[PDB]
Design a protein around this nucleic acid. Structure first.
Ligand code: CA
Ligand code: CA
Ligand code: CA
Ligand code: CA
Ligand code: CA
Ligand code: CA
Lengths: 150, 146, 150, 146
DNA sequence: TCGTGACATTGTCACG
DNA sequence: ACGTGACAATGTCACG
DNA sequence: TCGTGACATTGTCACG
DNA sequence: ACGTGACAATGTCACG
């Protein structure tokens, strides 16, 4: 259980979630007849500032087929809300070319590491360790001295 | 370089106005609520009919929004025709801010694209293994002779 | 307890031990007066074939100062009598030069091994293992091939 | 090459006869017990006097024994003058029959003395270590470079 | 006591 | 007739 | 339920 | 005026 969830803000989250889905053409309520449907959506609107009210509206009006989706959306908001306090916990999306993504995904599977982790590997193994041509030479130089004339 | 099928495009254009309106934005370039709403109310009826949409746009849409709508719509075209073939389509990936930085900075330097750089990191490293699987095998033949 | 000691032969051993020491000028008996001394030695002589008799003669006449020495001599006879059945158990004495003995004794101390064992070491380490000049060469021959051009 | 001090030597000679007699040997070159014993009885009285011993020997000692006495006495001289200095004295050592053989055969081959051979075995081997403490140190410097 | 290894003493032989 | 190496047989002693 | 990582969709910007 | 890379913000889903 990483994050503290205070209903006041979480509640406000769903309120906006609901109101938004409604504006995008979705049956927020669980009422089969349009009459009561619009009669419930109108009450949801005037619940803007009241947090205790929303949770109730959900219990007696929200479309049950929204439940899981709303939870999953609220879980994202929580994590993102907290992970936003600092930058190192913040995520950044980088949409790159297919063929490229694929070649990068393969490694993530042939190493079992995370994408964001595999990207770090390539940054180190290549940028930090660059002296394997000379090592091949010098090592023979030293061996030559002991294994031959001195 | 993409074909802009005004029929489909006029669609996107419609939704954008609607959507923006339904979000509380100024779809009109007026002041009062009278002629304002009337514009919208009329735009709503342009559902199936495209040729009439543009008509409304040119005579009502807020100049402010017009700027954005252009980019937005222009953006849809690219993505639209891109998803017509999987290899021409880009996929989004997430990175830990720190991980993103190391990569971003690295690319901004070489001047190449994020995707470009990534491709580089893969080869630069798998080229190094050419040595790891090199000096390691030699040292193994060395101890074996003893 | 390695060897079986049957009084009959052991007894005969001491009988000869005693009789011998007497002939070499030693007070076999524990009798202070020569009179009884010769009177005891004469009885010992006629005990030649009788084994049970000897052990008794020892108990009432033998010089106590002979005890330990006789035991130590009899312990040698036992071991030697048995160890004589076969050759590999038989010992062989080799008197060699001082300076030589010394150099050989040193090794026996710097290895904590037995003389007869140290002599075996020298026979093996020198006679059996004679190929350390070529090994120094060939080993470089092989290393040269892998560590250089092939 | 040793000096044979007849005085001391005549001593050894005396004891030998006595001892041999006391062991049941024929100290005389006779047949019957009469003149035989009388010879001995007389020899016993030659205790302190040496010059008289030889006298008896030449006229009584068994020819058979005379052969041995010679070697025996001649053997004492060597040992006697040898023990006058520790480095000139030899010390006896025991070996397991098998161990003795390996050494004996080895020497009978090179034609040299047991003591000689032993000296050889020591050097031949400590010369080998010149390599054991050689190739071992090189192989240790070899792995260290890796 | 016991077994054992390291020596020691004495006597022969054989060989050079 | 010798000096000598190699034994064989025997006895002690100090260990463990 | 929860946290999480992998994606996806949409909308802007800025730049060439 | 466009195609485009880079985001930001948001939503889902399948894991464990
Ligand atoms: Ca000891
Ligand atoms: Ca010989
Ligand atoms: Ca023991
Ligand atoms: Ca997953
Ligand atoms: Ca850019
Ligand atoms: Ca988890």
């Amino acid at each position: 259980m990483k994050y503290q969830q205070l209903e006041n803000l979480e509640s406000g989250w769903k309120w906006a979630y609901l109101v938004k889905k409604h504006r995008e053409g979705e049956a927020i309520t669980r009422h089969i007849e349009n009459s009561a449907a619009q009669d419930a959506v109108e009450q949801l609107m005037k619940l803007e500032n009241e947090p205790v009210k929303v949770q109730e509206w959900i219990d007696a009006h929200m479309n049950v087929n929204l439940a899981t989706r709303m939870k999953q959306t609220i879980r994202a908001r929580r994590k993102r809300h907290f992970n936003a306090e600092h930058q190192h916990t913040r995520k950044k999306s980088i949409d790159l070319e297919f063929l490229v993504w694929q070649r990068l995904a393969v490694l993530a599977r042939r190493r079992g590491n995370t994408l964001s982790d595999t990207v770090v590997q390539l940054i180190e193994d290549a940028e930090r360790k660059e002296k394997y041509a000379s090592q091949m030479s010098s090592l023979k130089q030293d061996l030559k001295d002991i294994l031959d004339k001195e």
